[PDB]
Design a protein around this motif. Structure first.
Motif, PDB file in Angstrom:
ATOM      1  N   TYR A  52       0.828  -1.198   0.000  1.00 35.13           N
ATOM      2  CA  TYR A  52       0.000   0.000   0.000  1.00 35.13           C
ATOM      3  C   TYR A  52       0.872   1.262   0.000  1.00 35.13           C
ATOM      4  CZ  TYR A  52      -3.735  -3.342   0.799  1.00 35.13           C
ATOM      5  OH  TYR A  52      -4.610  -4.418   0.691  1.00 35.13           O
ATOM      6  N   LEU A  53       0.265   2.401  -0.330  1.00 29.38           N
ATOM      7  CA  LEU A  53       0.993   3.669  -0.536  1.00 29.38           C
ATOM      8  C   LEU A  53       1.588   4.292   0.738  1.00 29.38           C
ATOM      9  CD1 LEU A  53       0.345   3.304  -3.448  1.00 29.38           C
ATOM     10  CD2 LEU A  53      -1.067   5.375  -3.399  1.00 29.38           C
ATOM     11  N   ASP A  54       1.132   3.851   1.910  1.00 24.90           N
ATOM     12  CA  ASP A  54       1.824   4.154   3.168  1.00 24.90           C
ATOM     13  C   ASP A  54       3.054   3.239   3.445  1.00 24.90           C
ATOM     14  OD1 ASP A  54       0.597   1.741   3.984  1.00 24.90           O
ATOM     15  OD2 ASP A  54      -0.175   2.580   5.847  1.00 24.90           O
TER      16      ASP A  54
ATOM     17  N   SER B 228       3.097  -0.006   4.025  1.00 28.63           N
ATOM     18  CA  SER B 228       2.739  -1.257   4.717  1.00 28.63           C
ATOM     19  C   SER B 228       2.386  -2.352   3.719  1.00 28.63           C
ATOM     20  CB  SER B 228       1.568  -1.063   5.702  1.00 28.63           C
ATOM     21  OG  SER B 228       0.344  -0.767   5.040  1.00 28.63           O
TER      22      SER B 228
END
Lengths: 49, 49
Positions: B41-43, B45
Motif C-alpha cells: 500500500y501507498l503508506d 505497509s
C-alpha cells in the motif's frame, strides 16, 4: 447557473465491522473510491493501511 | 541402570537410544507447488497471503 443535488436513489450507507484482532477493520460502504476510504479510516485510527 | 536392576526386584530401570532418518517430499512436483499474493500500500505497509 444553479447547482444540482446528486439524488442517487441509495442514500449514504456504510457498515464498519472491527474484527477483534490487531485493530483490523472491515469497511462496507457505498463509495466510488475504496482506496480513499481505507486512507481516511486508517489515518483516523492511527493504523497502517 | 544395570547396577540398579541388580539391587531392586520390584522396581526396574531401562535405557534406550534410537536414531532418526525422516525423509521429506511428496509424490510429484505438482503436489509441492505453492503460491502467494503480496500488496504494498501507498503508506509502505504490506499485506501478504
Amino acid at each position: 447557473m444553479g447547482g444540482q443535488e446528486h439524488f442517487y436513489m441509495e442514500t449514504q450507507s456504510m457498515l464498519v465491522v472491527p474484527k477483534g484482532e490487531d485493530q483490523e477493520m472491515d469497511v462496507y460502504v457505498s463509495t466510488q473510491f475504496p482506496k480513499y476510504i481505507q486512507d481516511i479510516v486508517a489515518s483516523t485510527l492511527k493504523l497502517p493501511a | 541402570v544395570e547396577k540398579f536392576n541388580a539391587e531392586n526386584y520390584w522396581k526396574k530401570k531401562g535405557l534406550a537410544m534410537v536414531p532418526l532418518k525422516f525423509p521429506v517430499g511428496l509424490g510429484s512436483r505438482a503436489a509441492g507447488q505453492a503460491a502467494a499474493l503480496v500488496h504494498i500500500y501507498l503508506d509502505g505497509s504490506v499485506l501478504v497471503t
